[PDB]
Structure formats: C-alpha cells, structure tokens
Amino acid sequence: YQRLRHMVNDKFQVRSTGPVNSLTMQPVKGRKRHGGIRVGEMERDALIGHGTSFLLQ
C-alpha cells in the first residue's frame, strides 16, 4: 500500500460572524480570514425550488 501525499481537509472552515467588505457589507472571502461561504445563483435557484422563501431571506 501507498500513502498519497494530499491532506484533503485543508479547506475545513466555520464562520458565525466574521469580517465584511466595506462596499457590499457582506462576509469577506478567505478561509483563514474567518471568511464566508458563498451561496451562489444555483443555491438561490434551489431555495426558490423548495418554495422556501424564509431560507432564501
């Protein structure tokens, strides 16, 4: 057996309330910077899909 060099849990992150960009006032990008997880157009579409308006809000 061979052990592959990669440590897959390198992008492991958690954010409650971290820093925000001045213009958008939205969670700033950066795992190590206590950054936010992006909810993109597809996730927006999925939340519209369930008809789950408060989850989208």
Add this chain to the structure above:
Amino acid sequence: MDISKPVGSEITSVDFGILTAKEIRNLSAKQITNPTVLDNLGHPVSGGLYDLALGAFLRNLCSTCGLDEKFCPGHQGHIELPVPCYNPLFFNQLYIYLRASCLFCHHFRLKSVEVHRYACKLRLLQYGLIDESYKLDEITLDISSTLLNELKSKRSEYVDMAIAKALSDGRTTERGSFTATVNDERKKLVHEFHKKLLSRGKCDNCGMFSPKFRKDGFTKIFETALNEKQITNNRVKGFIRQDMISTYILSTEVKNILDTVFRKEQCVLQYVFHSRPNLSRKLVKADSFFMDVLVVPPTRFRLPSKLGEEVHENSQNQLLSKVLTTSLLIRDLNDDLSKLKVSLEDRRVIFSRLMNAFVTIQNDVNAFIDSTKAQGRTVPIPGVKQALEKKEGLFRKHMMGKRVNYAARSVISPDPNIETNEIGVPPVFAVKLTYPEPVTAYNIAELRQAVINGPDKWPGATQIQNEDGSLVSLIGMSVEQRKALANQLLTPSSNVSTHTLNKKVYRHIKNRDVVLMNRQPTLHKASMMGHKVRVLPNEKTLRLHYANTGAYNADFDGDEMNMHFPQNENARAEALNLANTDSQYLTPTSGSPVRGLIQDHISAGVWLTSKDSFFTREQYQQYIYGCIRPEDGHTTRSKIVTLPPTIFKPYPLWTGKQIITTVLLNVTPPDMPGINLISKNKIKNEYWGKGSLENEVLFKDGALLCGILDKSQYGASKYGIVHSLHEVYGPEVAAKVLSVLGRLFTNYITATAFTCGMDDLRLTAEGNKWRTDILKTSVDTGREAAAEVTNLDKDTPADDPELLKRLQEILRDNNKSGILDAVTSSKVNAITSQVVSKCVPDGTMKKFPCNSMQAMALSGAKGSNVNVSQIMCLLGQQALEGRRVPVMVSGKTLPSFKPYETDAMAGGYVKGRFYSGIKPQEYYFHCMAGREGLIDTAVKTSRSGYLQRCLTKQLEGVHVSYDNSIRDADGTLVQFMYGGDAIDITKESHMTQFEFCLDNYYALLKKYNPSALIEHLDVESALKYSKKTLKYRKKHSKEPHYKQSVKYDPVLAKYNPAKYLGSVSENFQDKLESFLDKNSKGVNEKKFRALMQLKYMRSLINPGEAVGIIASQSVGEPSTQMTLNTFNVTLGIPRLREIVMTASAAIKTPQMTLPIWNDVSDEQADTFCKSISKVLLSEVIDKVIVTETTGTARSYVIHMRFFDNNEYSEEYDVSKEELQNVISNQFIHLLEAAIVKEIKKQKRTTGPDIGVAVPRLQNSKRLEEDNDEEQSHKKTKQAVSYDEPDEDEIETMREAENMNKVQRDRQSAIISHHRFITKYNFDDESGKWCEFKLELAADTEKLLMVNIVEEICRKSIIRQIPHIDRCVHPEPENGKRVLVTEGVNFQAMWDQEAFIDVDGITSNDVAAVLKTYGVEAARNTIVNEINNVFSRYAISVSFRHLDLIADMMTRQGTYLAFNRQGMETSTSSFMKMSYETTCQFLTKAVLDNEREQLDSPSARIVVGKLNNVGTGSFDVLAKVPNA
C-alpha cells in the same frame, strides 16, 4: 436580522429616473473643486474628494451629520462641470433625436400627422388596449392643413373616448394596465417610430434639408455639409420664412437644438418616454441626456484599499481627480476668453481652443462612467459601468448570490450509525455556530446551563443580548461571571421603552437544530436539503449517511459539503418541513426515489432474508434492539413486540425474513393495518434451486412471507418495499424504515461479514472446457467475415492474392473499412455472447449465493454480469470510436501481426480474461479502448450549466396560483392547469397502481381521512358532469379529432379538483373505469372508485409550488448524463440547445416524417423516395474525356460517358429526356460562366507578390493539469453560478439579429443560346453518352478543362424539390409505415396526397411547423422533440415540465428562446439587469420611466423583499380578542 427589531415601513416599488442638475446642487453636502485629496501633514483638503462633509474619514468626525466612521452613512457631493457633457449611457438616444430633427422649424422631419399617429397609438398603449391602437389606423378621411388638423382631431377624439370607456370598466386603472404583450406592442412602436424618424431626409413640415450628423466610437458629433442640390433648396424656401415672422458641433449646440425640438415635440415624447401614464405631469426635457454636474459618491464608497501594510489609492478618486483638473483648466480658458475683443477675424483658433476644452472634459466624464468609451492611455482604470459588470456583475456576484454568516465547510465522511435525516457535526463547528435563542420561562433552565458552560463547553453559549440591544460576550469571562449573568437572564426590564423585549442567548448548535446541507453543483433542489444536527465527539469531518449519497450526487472520494445554520424559527420550520431530507424521497423529475441503501446493506439483505438464514431467541432479539431503540423514539408501541418462532420443535428458531417483519411491526403505526405488496427481485428463481418462489417479494399484513430483498426493494428503486411503505404510511415512516434497515444490515455485516476473493473468480474444469471449445471457433470467424464483405465464394484462403488486393481497397476507404469492421464485430460478439451464456453461471466453480462476485452483480450492490464475464470469460472485441482497432498504411494493426491479417485477434478481439491474464497484443488494444473513454471526457465542450441558467432566470417567477393555474411573477397566465390535471409528480406514482391501492384499501382510507373533509367538498356535481363528457366521448370514438364534439369540455375545466370529488383528468377516469371493468373481485367497486377519486384529490400540486424552477431543474440536472458523444440527426445537449437556448429557424438536421398509406407498397414507396431525393449530374456520370486539340483555336472535345440508361433510371428515377434538358439549359451555361471566370482570373493576377509578407498558417499550466489536479481546484471552489458558456455556446451567441435532321435543328438552336460551343450530339436512342465541342480564342491558351468540368458536374442539379436533399425509407417506427426526409417543405408534400397522409406529416423543425400549421402545432413539436432527446438516453422527464417549458416559449404566440432576445418581453427590469448587460437594461428602464413592481424573484432579492413563491404566496394575520 433581529426579531426584537421589527420594521413598520416597506418598499413597494422602485421608480427609474434621471437626476436633474438643480436636484443634485440642493442635496449636495459639499462642492468638490480640488484635484488633490490630502493637505500637508495628512488632513483632507477642503473642496477635495476626502472632504469631511462627504463623511467621517481619518479618525475625524463628519462635517454634515457629526458622526464617526461607524455610524456615519456617508454623504453625496457634486462636481460643477464648466461645460455640459453628453451622458455616455444616453448618448445613442440623444443622437437618434438629433438626426431625426429639422434644424429650421425645430420639429421632427416626419410629418406632424404621422407623428401624432404614433403619439395616439403610444397613449392608448399606456393603458392595456392594443386592439384600439390598431383600430386608430382605420381612422382615415400634398394634403391641406385644414383637412389634416381634422384627422388629428378625430384621432384624438377616439383616443379620449377609448381611454374613458375602458376606464369606466375594470379594463384599465388611472395608473394604466401594463403586461408583457402590452410591452411588446410598445417596444415595436417605439422602434418603428425611430425608424420612420431617421428615414426622412427632407423635412415634411417645412421642405428645407438639414445637414446630416455623423458619430465616432467616443461621445462626439460632427455636421456634414449639405450638397449644392440641397443648398439651392434652402434658398427657394427662404422667402416663406419671412412671411411667418464635415465640422465638429459643440455639446451646447446639440443641447440647444434638442431643447427646442423637445419643447415643440413634447406631445409625442411624453408617451415615447413614459411606459405608463405620466401622473407626476413632469416635463420631458433634453437636459436629462446632458450632464451639467457630476454626483460625488460618499467617502464611504470611495475608501482607499488597504492590503497588509500598503494603503492603495481608490480608482474612483483617481478618475474623479482627472475631471477636477480639466474643470479648473476650462474655468481659466473661459476667464481668458472673457478678457479678450475688438480684434478677431482669425476665429478658427478660438473655436479650436473650445473644441479641445469640450473633447477633454467629455473624455474625463466618459472615463468615469464607462471606460470602453474613453481614449487609450499609454489596462485603463474601470468606470462605474465596469464596476457593475466586473466579471459576472454586481447583481450576479453580490445580489443574486452572497457570502453568508453562520455557515461551515468540510470534507464529508460516511456514517451508517446516524439517522438518514441527520448530519454528523464536528465539535469544532458546534462550539462556533450559535443560534439567537430568546430567554423565556419555559427555557430559562436550558439556557442558564449554556451560559454557565460558556463558548468552549458544548452545549454552551458564545454571547448574551440584553433587552436594551447591547451584547455581552462570554468569551473572556470565567465560570464566576457566567454564573452571575445566568441568574440575571429572566430579570424584568426596568425601562418601559424595552419592557416588550426579553434577553437573547447566542447558544451553541444543539442536537435539535436544523441545518442546510449543500453539495455543489446544486443542479436540483435535492442537492440542498435540511438535516438534523447530531454533534459527534472527537470528529474533524462532516459525517453523512449512505441514503443521502444519491440526491447530493456526492461520493466519499474527498468531496466537500457546505453547512448553513439558519438563524430564525421561520427559516427553521422551512428546513424541517419543506426542504428537509424525508420530504425529498422522490425527485420531481420522474417521481421516482433518490433515497435508499447503496452497497454492504444490499449484500447483507440478500444473505439475511435468505431461506438458509435462521436465528436463536438471543440472536433474534439482539438484531431487533440493535436497529430499533425505543429511547431514541424508533418504536410506535413503547414496548418491543416480537413474533413467535417459525420453528418450535426441536429448537426454537426465527427466520431471517421474520426480523424484517418485526422491524416493520415496531416502526409502522399500531392503529393502521400491515402493508400488502406483491413485488419482484433482481435475483431469478433459478439461482435459489428447484421450485423456489424467492423472486416473488410477498408482504401480507406487514409480513415478509416470500422472496429476498434486493437493491429493487430498499434501494432508490420505484415500487419497492420502502416506496410502498412511503405511499401507505408516509415519508416519516419510510425514513424510519430506511434508518432502521440501514442499522440492521450494518450490525448484521458486523456479526456476519461479507467478502470477495479468487474462489469467486474461478470457473470449474467443466466450465473452462466449454470456454476453450467455443473460443476455438473464433479463429475461423476472422477470415469468414473478411471473405463475406469482400464478396468471395467457397471461402477463399487467408493468404489469397485476390483477397489481399480486395482488402487493400477496403483499407483506403473509411466507409468500406466500416462495413468490414461492423460485420466482423457482430460475428465475434456472437461468439462472445455464446461463451458468456454457457459459462456463466452454469460453468462457474463457486456459485450464488456463496460466489460473492456473482452475488454483488445480481443483487445490484455493485457491478454487472458484463464485468463478471470480462473477469471469468473474455474481454471481447475492443471497440474504438464505434469501429475496431486502428490500422496502419501498411495494412498492419500492430508490428506483430501480418499485413492485411484476417484474424479476430488482429482486429482487437480479446479471447483472454482478467483472471488468466491478457497477451501483450490484447494489452495494447485494451489500452487503446480504455484511454478512448478518458479522451472523450477531456474533449466534451457540451455543458448543462448555461442551458439551466437560461431556463431558471426566465421561469423563477412561474408558480402554482391559489386558482390552480400556472402564473408568472407578474400575474400573467402561462398555463390554466399544471400538465392539464394539477397533479404533483412526487404523488403521481401509485395513483394508477389500483391493485396495490385495493390490497391496502383500509390502510389508505385511514391515511386519506375523509370524515374531516365530507362537509367541505361536493360529492355529485363533478361526478354527474364526468358521465356527460364520457357520453359524448364514446359517441365520437371512431370520428377524427377535428370532427369531435365541443359541447361539454373536460370536468377539470368546470370544477375545482380540491373542492369537487370527481373532477379528475379524463386519462385517470379512463384508466380507473377500465380497471373496474377488467377486474371483478369487503370492498365494493363503487367505494373503491371514491377512494381513488379522493387519492387524486390528495395528489394535487400545492398553490405556491415553484413549478418554473422545478421544470428547468428537471430538464437541466438529467441533461448532464448526455454529455458523451454519438456511438445522422442532432442529439443530446446540441439538439436541446437548438430548441430551448436558441429556438433556431435554421436547424442542423431538418427532417420530415411522411406517413405512407397501406395501398402504397414497399417497392412503390422506394420509387417515391427516388422521385423526391435530389439528383446531381455527378451521380449519373461514369467518365468524362476531354480531348484538348489546338488548331487553326482551342478545341475542347468533352465526351460525357454516363452509366447505362436502365441503371440510373432504376437508381435515381431519372430519364434520358430529363438528362438532355439539364445539359442543354443548365450545365453548358454554368460551364461557359466558369471558363470565362477562369480566363479573367488568369489575366488579373499574373503571380504572387515576392518580398511582401503573406498571412501565417496557424492557463498553459491548467491545460497540463491531470483530473486529480483539476478536480481538486473544483473541490475547493464555491461556484459563482452554472459553469460557463465559453465553448461552442459563445460562438453561437456571436450572431446578431453523321447526324439526324431533328438533332441538327436542336444543335443550331443551342449554338444561338451559347457563345462558345460549336457541336452538340446526345445519345437519344440508347441514352449512354453526350458529346459537345467547345471553341476558344488563340489568346485563351492553356486551361485545366477536366478539373473545371468535374466541379460543375457535382454543382449541376438534374432534379431537386426545394429545401429537400434526400428522402429515405427506414424500418417502421412502432408499427407506423413512414418516410424520413432530409429537408422541410410541407406544400410540396401536400401534392403527394396519393402516397402521403397529409394530416400526419411530422417535422422536427419547430419554426417551419409554426409558419405553416400554427403556434399550437409548434408547441406540440417542442414537447415531442425535447422528449426525443431524453427518451434516446433512456431518461424519463415528466411531460408536465416539457408542457410548461413549451407554453413559456409560445406565450407570445411566436417561438421564443431562453436567452436575451426572448427575455426582452418581460416586465422586471431588475430580473433583466441580473441576467446580462446590466447598464443596457437599466438605460432602457430609465428611458421608459419604468416602475419596478418588485414582483419577480430577482427584483425582490435586489430590494431585500420576501420572495412571493411558496411561503411568500400569502400573509399571516393574528386574531386579537379585545375590540
């Protein structure tokens, strides 16, 4: 968001307009005049971009609101432009109005009566009345002014009357009615108006010509001088003026021209610029297109970017400083201009100084707004247009999608010990993710502990919010302070201003919380479900159960998942009751399951439920409690009930099947009876020995009495045990059964393991003998097939010289090699099938159930009988791109094989298996075929990302209304009923499973409780009507669809399905009645009818359901499975793109399906095929001999040697007479034109230019990245949207909207019609040749006549029916005798009534069908064609989705596609702005003076309003008792 902080005011609508200079000057906090931003020392300079009046900056307080950097919102300022500038966004429009106006009378050059006609039509369109706008054109009486003014009066009279009449009724409000069709009619007119405006040259009012205005890329206009004809026109029309009383043009001159024109033509422009009536009564002024000032955004939005230590200057301040420098310079130029003047004459310099001053400030203004409109500087600084469209745009990157708080990301790890509806949360996330829990009397105990525990001990609390609004962090505090604060949580509020409020505790995520689990790409809503939090100690990864693997399309290969923690109870309720996992058992795509156990559990079940599996009392009870724990709420009886043993004497023993009976007996409700189901298995009875019935799955009163349980029962498979349980007991019970079975099989696999080894791969000595004997016949097959394709009798030897010459002919042709490959492959594959059928399983040493390799393939746990046969028998023929192994120019498939070898092995046929090993030749051939697949995965530009993105943006608003109809976001009706029956796809499964429903009558009667409904519905109205429709339907059964009765329409059209029992689809009615007739079986046939009627009632789609998104997701998500290439017509994603994305009128493969009669024979139909198929001269010619002889004149003797007369007449249906006409009329005229062109081309360019350069013949690390290197980047990136169209889609978007006497007379007549021929003799008797002599001049010299003739022959058409290339006769499709055409022309086929049934002539071309047969026919073509794309890849998509998509494409009565063009006719400008060309759609919105009603999902997201779909489709009001 704080529930303690409610909001009383709300934005209902957004109005688009232009800021006036007077307006900006008043609201401005400070006038910006200085280009410097900082004084010396470091303080902001007064009158600069960092002035403190624009807000708090550099630890200084704001000089307007007095607040610091935190609380100061920032304030707007202004720059005073020394000269007016053209606003870049509205330059194109002001340009249109400048070119359209007269420079003398200062009216538009179009006649006033024609202008008034547009003003009238546009006024009537402000209100929703299109019919009246067209009826205005009917009002009709070089024409006198007294007559034309009466026409304007009569037209105005009709306009005022039509508005008042419609205003009296509920046809239009005072604010005016506005629909997409109304918008379409407005957009058409405003376009036609500007087109007519620009077309006029000479002014129709005063006959004087105006000088034409030209433009460049940048905002700058020039005036082209008039011609002498137009200058003399000004002179003669100069006297009539008295009785009534290229050069650059400055911005002021243009503004002054438009100022008077906008005053004089105010009446039409009032309706040209207002979408709805102008109730504000504002004047339409020209200065809206001009900028006399520039607003300076607050310092807050222009802060200098800080990256580590370096503080970088803001790019907007840089662009603004440039505008300030130029403004100070023009102020000096105007000051020097003011000084001096008596001395002038040379005024060419003062205008030159002015032109520079104007073009410089304009450029600085342009550079600030839109950089791609400014001059090149020696990458430029981005403008405000560029800021809104940086990449995807501000709307897409920061409005439609956003980075969120209270969310986590981690690699997922499998876990069978957690519930199927749960998520294993690492304690790392549990101590950081908190919920704002308000402290009350019922939860004071729970939260006091959390407060004491603090932010590092779970379940704790990170913070506490007091009723005054302040926050108290528990992070730095010790156990002593936390204990004190906990005893202060329920203290009464002293302040009367906050007595209403109560404290909040920001408590750690507990095991009772909801979380949103997401696995990207989120192709369908099942990839974003609600999971129950289960904090697992000593964990560093997110734990997920195997039942969730399908829906997320997540494999535990190092995948990543996003966890979202919603922060309010409304969001909680939604994630627990709507988006929760258990409510996502069935996908809305086909209504089939996406939840079930995957591998070990399937193999465990086949062993556990086997007859041989027996268990003692101790063993049996252990397996029960092992998976069912009453303390975890798994039971329904509060005591574990147990069945008696199946064996009493000698020893008490329980069967394996009894464990399955006991699990159901403890998880299903006691009040309801047991499940009754007769299903089947994947494992055939033959495997279980003689006379076994172990394939028949039998459940009688919730007891497994016969058959084992496969992937077909507790996997994600329709009509299995779990699905049957789901229909009878609900989704919560089915979820419990899945988790219970999941535990049982995990525990069973721990006590009784499952393994795979070499013993499972071996054949017996008998079985291996069969293998060698069948494969011994395969050696002959190679040469046999080679002798068949080559056409050689008695089967010639492998080394035959004639055969080897014949195989060479095959080698050089791609088609000939294809015939050889397909024949040899079919023959060797027949030998493969024989080996496999004999050896597996009757020849395997170890046999099922013990042969685990065999077991896994049969159970559906993993693998198939094909994989099993490659392992134990042979790999077979290695197929490469539909053919065999590639062959070299030498005729060798490898250097080891003989040239033109007639052997199966040489062609790639592998006799070897993976157990015994594969030979080096076979190894290399396997390497070829193995790689071939991975190459296809590398070269596959087709993506479902953009296709789904286009559908979802146009269908987002489309949902189910409370009146059961399918309505868009703006209330416009799309469908009158969902799929014409209003059924939810996630319910339409057992609705036709009548026998199932009958066997479970009392179980379902208890489920669909009618006792609490009988008082709310009607039991006869619809049932009586259903009989009346059935009566008239049976009367016209044999009659055609056009002759059918229209007296009574369907029962669903007249009676609400949720209020009237019996208002069911005629499809359901016919199916239900047919069951009661064909099956005569204490349930009556009348009481069963009522139950099924009630089942349909309870299967209705809920009002609010986003059927739009669901439809696009149901077309998008499965279109990912058809990314692979063809194994003629366009298939997969390219064909789907031709329909949905581009709605092409020019299809790649246009076809026509012609249904042939019964009286027309197979020979007659083939003769008919030839009669329509396009025939070329090339197709009938065998040889052309050109005898170039130069004498006296270049003589060219062209002899056309055709095939025999009877040969081409039987192959193309072409006569000798037909050939004569084409050569004598077309071919010679085409040949003469080609020779003349070749003589000119010879004398034009003598040769290529020597020394002069000619044109050349023809991310880097990313393209060299392997799949493990490329998927790792996708593994970490959280996608902005739906992939990218940068492939073929971008290039598709690159399209903007001795001779006889009779023979002598014939020759002489042809000589008079052709300039170069001398002789013309054609075979009239036999019809085999055509000879003609061509005479050329002595100066024409050398020419390549053969090559010239050749090219014209394949260009000459003998016979062709317009737009049709070839008509073929395929195999009868589903019993229907049809002919497939490679072209479309209905009117031509209409004349072939003797052969074709003109009422059944199908066509794939939607646009062609629309043009001839109408919108409803095109609509039916869309639903059929999209279905053909999915049915080919064996993908089932509900017609309810396709019908909705088709209805949306045909909403305008035309064929609209899901793209920028189709979208143009949509109410929401915000939806349009968030799709593409944000500034362009915004400009169109402002110019229309549009009101965004905020009714589209996109618009609501933009303004932070709750979406109107689902939970937002109503309002919640509280009932209060006191008066």
Add this chain to the structure above:
Amino acid sequence: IFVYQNNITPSAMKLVPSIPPATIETFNEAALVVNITHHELVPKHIRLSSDEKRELLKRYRLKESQLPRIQRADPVALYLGLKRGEVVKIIRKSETSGRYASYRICM
C-alpha cells in the same frame, strides 16, 4: 374571402382594410390545398363569444393581455378569421391528462 391564384398587386393589397365594418380576407389556393385544422398536431380551436370571453376573464381574474397569445397572422387564426381581442378555446390531448382546455387571445 378572396381566393387569389399567384399574387396580388401591392396597391390592390391596400384596398383590403379600406371599407369598415366589412372585413376582407385573402387566401392563396396553393396554401388551401390541405386543411391545417385536419392535422393531428393542430387541436380544436373554437372562437369564443364576447360573453364567453367575459366569463373566462372573470373566473381567473384575468386582463385581456395577461392571457397566452395567438398571432393575428397565425395559420389557424387566419383560418377561423380571428380579430384582435377575440379569445380562442383550445381543446388539446395531453399524454398526462387527456382532453385539456387551454385558451389564447388574438392580438
């Protein structure tokens, strides 16, 4: 109804909507060779009375334009001789519900 053979003069075509309330409809005999409403893909289109339209706009609380559209120059619209405002009832066979009544407004 005026059934022409090959073509009509552009000057003559202007005389068609010149005499209201009388309406003139032109048809090419080559285009009338086969009836389009007889085709399997063309459902039964029925023109509704001013009262039937009035009732439909009430049941669904619709505005004329808020309905699915049929072009005035659509082959079936030209067949039944539809005028702008006239609502047409379409009885279409579905492979999910069977007979289904849908509607379209001619604009």
